[PDB]
Short mmCIF file of C-alpha atoms and ligand atoms in Angstrom, two decimals:
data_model
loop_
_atom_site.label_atom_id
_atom_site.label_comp_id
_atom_site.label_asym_id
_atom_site.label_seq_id
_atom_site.Cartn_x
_atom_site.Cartn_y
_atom_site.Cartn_z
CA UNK U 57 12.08 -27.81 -0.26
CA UNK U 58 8.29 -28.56 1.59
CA UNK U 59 5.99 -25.63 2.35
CA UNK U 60 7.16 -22.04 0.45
CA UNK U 61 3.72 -20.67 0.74
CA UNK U 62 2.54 -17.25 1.56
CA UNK U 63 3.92 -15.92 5.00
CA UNK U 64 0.89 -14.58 5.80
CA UNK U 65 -2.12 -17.43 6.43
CA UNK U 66 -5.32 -16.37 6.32
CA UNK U 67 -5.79 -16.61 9.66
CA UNK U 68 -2.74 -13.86 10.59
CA UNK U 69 -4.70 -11.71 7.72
CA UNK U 70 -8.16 -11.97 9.80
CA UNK U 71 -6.47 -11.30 12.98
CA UNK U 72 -4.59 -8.34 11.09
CA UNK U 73 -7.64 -7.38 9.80
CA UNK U 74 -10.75 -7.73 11.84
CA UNK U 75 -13.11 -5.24 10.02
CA UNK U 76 -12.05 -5.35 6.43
CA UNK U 77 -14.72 -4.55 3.57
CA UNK U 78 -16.07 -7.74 2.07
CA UNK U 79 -13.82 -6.22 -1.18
CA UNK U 80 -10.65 -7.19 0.69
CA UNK U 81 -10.10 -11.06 0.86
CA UNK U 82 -6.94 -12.90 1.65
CA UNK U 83 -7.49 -14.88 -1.59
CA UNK U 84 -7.27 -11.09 -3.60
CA UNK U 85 -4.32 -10.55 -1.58
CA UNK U 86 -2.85 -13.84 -2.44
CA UNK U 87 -3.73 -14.16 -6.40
CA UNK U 88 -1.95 -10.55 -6.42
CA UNK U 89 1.46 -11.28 -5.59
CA UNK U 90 2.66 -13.30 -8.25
CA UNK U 91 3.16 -9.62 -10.16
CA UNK U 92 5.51 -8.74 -7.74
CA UNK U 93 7.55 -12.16 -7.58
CA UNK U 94 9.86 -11.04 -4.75
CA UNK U 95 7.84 -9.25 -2.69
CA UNK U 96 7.48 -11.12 0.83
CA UNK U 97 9.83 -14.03 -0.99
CA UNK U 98 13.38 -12.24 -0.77
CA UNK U 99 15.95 -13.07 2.49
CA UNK U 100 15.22 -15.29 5.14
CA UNK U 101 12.11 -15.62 6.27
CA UNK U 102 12.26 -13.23 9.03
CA UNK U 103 12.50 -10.79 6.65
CA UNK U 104 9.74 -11.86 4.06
CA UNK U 105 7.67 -11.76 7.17
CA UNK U 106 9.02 -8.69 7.81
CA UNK U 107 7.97 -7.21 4.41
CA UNK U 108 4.76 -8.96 4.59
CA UNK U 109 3.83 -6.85 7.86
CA UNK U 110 5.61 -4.34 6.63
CA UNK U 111 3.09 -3.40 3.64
CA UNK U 112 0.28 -4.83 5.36
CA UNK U 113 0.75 -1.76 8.63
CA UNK U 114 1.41 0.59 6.00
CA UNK U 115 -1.76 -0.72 4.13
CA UNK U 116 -3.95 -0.46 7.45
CA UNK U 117 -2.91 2.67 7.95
CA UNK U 118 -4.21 4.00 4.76
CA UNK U 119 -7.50 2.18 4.67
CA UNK U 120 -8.41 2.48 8.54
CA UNK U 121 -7.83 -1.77 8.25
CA UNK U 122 -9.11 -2.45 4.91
CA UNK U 123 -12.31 -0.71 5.91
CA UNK U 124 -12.29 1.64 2.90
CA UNK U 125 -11.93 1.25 -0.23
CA UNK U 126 -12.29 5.09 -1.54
CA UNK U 127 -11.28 8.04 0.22
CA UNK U 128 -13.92 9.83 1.80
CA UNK U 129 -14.25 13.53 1.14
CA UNK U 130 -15.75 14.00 -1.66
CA UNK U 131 -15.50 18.01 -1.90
CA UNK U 132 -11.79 17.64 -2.39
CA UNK U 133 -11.50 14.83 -5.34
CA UNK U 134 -10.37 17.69 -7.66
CA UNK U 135 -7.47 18.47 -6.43
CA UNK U 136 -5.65 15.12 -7.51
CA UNK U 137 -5.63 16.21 -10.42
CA UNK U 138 -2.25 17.90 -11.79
CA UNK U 139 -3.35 19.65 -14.82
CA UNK U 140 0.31 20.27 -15.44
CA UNK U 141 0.55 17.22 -17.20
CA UNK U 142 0.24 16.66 -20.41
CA UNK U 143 -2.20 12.90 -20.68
CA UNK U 144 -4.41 15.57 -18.49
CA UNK U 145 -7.17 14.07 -16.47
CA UNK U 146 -9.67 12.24 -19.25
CA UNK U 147 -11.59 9.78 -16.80
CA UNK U 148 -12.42 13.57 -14.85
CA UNK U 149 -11.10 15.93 -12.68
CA UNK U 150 -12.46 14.79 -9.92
CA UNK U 151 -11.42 10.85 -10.94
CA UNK U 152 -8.10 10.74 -9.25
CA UNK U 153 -8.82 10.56 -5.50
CA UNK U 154 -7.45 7.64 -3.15
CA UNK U 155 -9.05 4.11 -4.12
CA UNK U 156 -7.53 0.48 -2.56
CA UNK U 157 -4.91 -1.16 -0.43
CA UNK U 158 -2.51 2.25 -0.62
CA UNK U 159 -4.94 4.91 -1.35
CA UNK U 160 -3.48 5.19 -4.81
CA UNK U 161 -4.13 9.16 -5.80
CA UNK U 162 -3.25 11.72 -8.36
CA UNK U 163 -3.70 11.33 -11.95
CA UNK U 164 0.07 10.78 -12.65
CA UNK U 165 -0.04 8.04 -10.43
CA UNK U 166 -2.91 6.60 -12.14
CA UNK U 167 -0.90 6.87 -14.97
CA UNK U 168 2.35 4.94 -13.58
CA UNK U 169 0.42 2.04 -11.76
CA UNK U 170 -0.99 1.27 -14.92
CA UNK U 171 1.84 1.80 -17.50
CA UNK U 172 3.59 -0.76 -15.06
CA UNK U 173 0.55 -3.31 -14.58
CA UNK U 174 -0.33 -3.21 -18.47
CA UNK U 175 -3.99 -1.32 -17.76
CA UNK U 176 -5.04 1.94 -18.53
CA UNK U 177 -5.51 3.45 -15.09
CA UNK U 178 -5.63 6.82 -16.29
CA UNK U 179 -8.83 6.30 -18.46
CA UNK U 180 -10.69 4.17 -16.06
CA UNK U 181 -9.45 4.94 -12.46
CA UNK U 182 -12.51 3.41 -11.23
CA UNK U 183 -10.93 -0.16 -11.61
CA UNK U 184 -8.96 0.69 -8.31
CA UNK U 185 -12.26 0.73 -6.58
CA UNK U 186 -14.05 -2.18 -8.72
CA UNK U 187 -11.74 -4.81 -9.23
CA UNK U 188 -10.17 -6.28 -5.74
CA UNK U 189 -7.19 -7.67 -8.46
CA UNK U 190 -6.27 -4.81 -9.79
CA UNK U 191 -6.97 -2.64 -6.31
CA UNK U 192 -4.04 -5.41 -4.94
CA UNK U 193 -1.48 -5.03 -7.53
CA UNK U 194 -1.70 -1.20 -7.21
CA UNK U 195 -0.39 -1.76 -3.53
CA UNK U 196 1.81 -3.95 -4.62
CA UNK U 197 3.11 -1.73 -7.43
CA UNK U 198 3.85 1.28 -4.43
CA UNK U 199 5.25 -0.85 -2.36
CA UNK U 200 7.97 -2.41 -5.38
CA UNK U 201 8.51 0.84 -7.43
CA UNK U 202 8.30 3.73 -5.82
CA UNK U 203 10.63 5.91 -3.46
CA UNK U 204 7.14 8.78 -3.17
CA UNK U 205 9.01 11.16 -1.01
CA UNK U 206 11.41 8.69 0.12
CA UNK U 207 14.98 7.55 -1.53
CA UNK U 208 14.24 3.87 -2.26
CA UNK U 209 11.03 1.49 -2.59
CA UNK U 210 9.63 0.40 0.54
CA UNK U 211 10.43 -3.15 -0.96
CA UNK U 212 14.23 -2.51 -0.76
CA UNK U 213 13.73 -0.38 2.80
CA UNK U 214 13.35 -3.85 3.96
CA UNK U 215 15.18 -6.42 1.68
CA UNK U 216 18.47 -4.01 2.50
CA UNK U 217 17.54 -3.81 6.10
CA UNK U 218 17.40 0.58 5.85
CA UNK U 219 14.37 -0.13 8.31
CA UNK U 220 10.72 0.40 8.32
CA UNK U 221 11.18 4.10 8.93
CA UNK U 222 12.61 4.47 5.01
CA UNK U 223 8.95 2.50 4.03
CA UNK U 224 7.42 5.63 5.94
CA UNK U 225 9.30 8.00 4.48
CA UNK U 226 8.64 6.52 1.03
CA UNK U 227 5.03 6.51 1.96
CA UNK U 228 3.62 10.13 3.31
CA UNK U 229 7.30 11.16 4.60
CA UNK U 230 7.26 14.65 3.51
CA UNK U 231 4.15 15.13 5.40
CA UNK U 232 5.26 13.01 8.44
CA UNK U 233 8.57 12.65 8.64
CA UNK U 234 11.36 15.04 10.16
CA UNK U 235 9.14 15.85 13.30
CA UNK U 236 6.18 16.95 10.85
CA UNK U 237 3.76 14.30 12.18
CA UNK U 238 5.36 12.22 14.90
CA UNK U 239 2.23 11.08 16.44
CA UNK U 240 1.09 9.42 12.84
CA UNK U 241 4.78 8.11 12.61
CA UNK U 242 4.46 6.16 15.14
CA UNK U 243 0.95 4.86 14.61
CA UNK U 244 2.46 3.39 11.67
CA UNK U 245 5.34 1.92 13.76
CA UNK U 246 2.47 0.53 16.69
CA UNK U 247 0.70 -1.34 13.68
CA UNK U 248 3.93 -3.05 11.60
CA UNK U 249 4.96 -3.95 15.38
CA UNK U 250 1.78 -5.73 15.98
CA UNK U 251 1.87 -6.86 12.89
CA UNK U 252 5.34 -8.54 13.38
CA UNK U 253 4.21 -10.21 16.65
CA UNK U 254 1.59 -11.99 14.84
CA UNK U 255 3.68 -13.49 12.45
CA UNK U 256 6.45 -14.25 14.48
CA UNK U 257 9.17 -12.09 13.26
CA UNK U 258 11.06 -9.04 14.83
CA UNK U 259 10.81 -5.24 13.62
CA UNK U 260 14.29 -4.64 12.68
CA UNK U 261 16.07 -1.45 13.25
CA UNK U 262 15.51 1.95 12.09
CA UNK U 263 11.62 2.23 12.71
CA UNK U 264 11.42 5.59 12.88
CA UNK U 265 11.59 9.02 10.21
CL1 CL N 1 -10.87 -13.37 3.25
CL1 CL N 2 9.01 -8.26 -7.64
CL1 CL N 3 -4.21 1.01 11.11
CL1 CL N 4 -13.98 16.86 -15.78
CL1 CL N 5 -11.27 -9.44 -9.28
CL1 CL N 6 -6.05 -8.04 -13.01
CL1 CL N 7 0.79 15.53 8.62
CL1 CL N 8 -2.01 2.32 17.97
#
């Protein structure tokens, strides 16, 4: 039964992660994940170390390796948010733009994450960029619930063995995917290999979108 810790030691994360903000700690990571109880924890352990680099590539990619915690241009915050809806945008219009580990954006996404974590996201979006705990199970709620542009969660992509390519698609893969951004692709796909090296595990099929 022995050692069913994380897959990840905090060594592989500082390695991973050389220039993280001081708002990004292994321990944030690691307090996080018992809201997502089989995330990095289902299939053999080459593939919970597959999901674990898996989200953590993905992650870097969004953040430039943990180095931001909000997006940066400030002149177009407005535009996350969909007036179409009908909650509307009460924390601002401008409130909405990409905070933590997966650059959670958009108002209605706001609204998801925290319907699903038990916090209201949509009145204080700032939490994302505030609270390392909450910023951590917003990646963790991407990663476990959502198909974005995709047809399954990025979780599954994995667990199922569909391949890292479906946790792209799922990700930015309108954008990206389908020869719209090939480069980025595989910038994604140079990072979760990496990734996989340092933990020891192999990439799996189907890297690609
Ligand atoms: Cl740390
Ligand atoms: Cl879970
Ligand atoms: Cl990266
Ligand atoms: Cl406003
Ligand atoms: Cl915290
Ligand atoms: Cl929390
Ligand atoms: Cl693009
Ligand atoms: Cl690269």
């Amino acid at each position: 039964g022995g050692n069913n810790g994380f897959v990840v030691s905090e060594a592989q994360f500082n390695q991973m992660f050389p220039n993280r903000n001081a708002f990004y700690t292994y321990k944030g990571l690691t307090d996080a994940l018992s809201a997502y109880p089989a995330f990095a924890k289902t299939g053999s352990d080459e593939v919970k170390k597959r999901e674990a680099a898996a989200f953590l590539a993905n992650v870097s990619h969004e953040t430039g390796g943990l180095f931001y915690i909000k997006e940066v241009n400030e002149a177009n915050y407005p535009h996350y948010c969909d007036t179409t809806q009908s909650y509307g945008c009460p924390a601002g219009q401008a409130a909405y733009y990409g905070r933590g580990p997966i650059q959670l954006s958009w108002n209605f996404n706001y609204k998801a994450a925290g319907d699903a974590l038990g916090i209201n996201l949509l009145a204080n979006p700032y939490l994302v960029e505030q609270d390392p705990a909450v910023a951590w199970k917003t990646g963790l709620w991407y990663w476990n619930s959502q198909n974005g542009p995709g047809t399954m969660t990025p979780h599954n992509a994995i667990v199922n063995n569909a391949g890292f390519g479906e946790t792209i698609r799922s990700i930015n893969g309108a954008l990206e995917c389908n020869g719209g951004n090939p480069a980025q692709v595989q910038s994604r796909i140079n990072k979760f290999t990496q990734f996989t090296q340092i933990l020891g595990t192999t990439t799996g099929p189907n890297l690609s979108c």
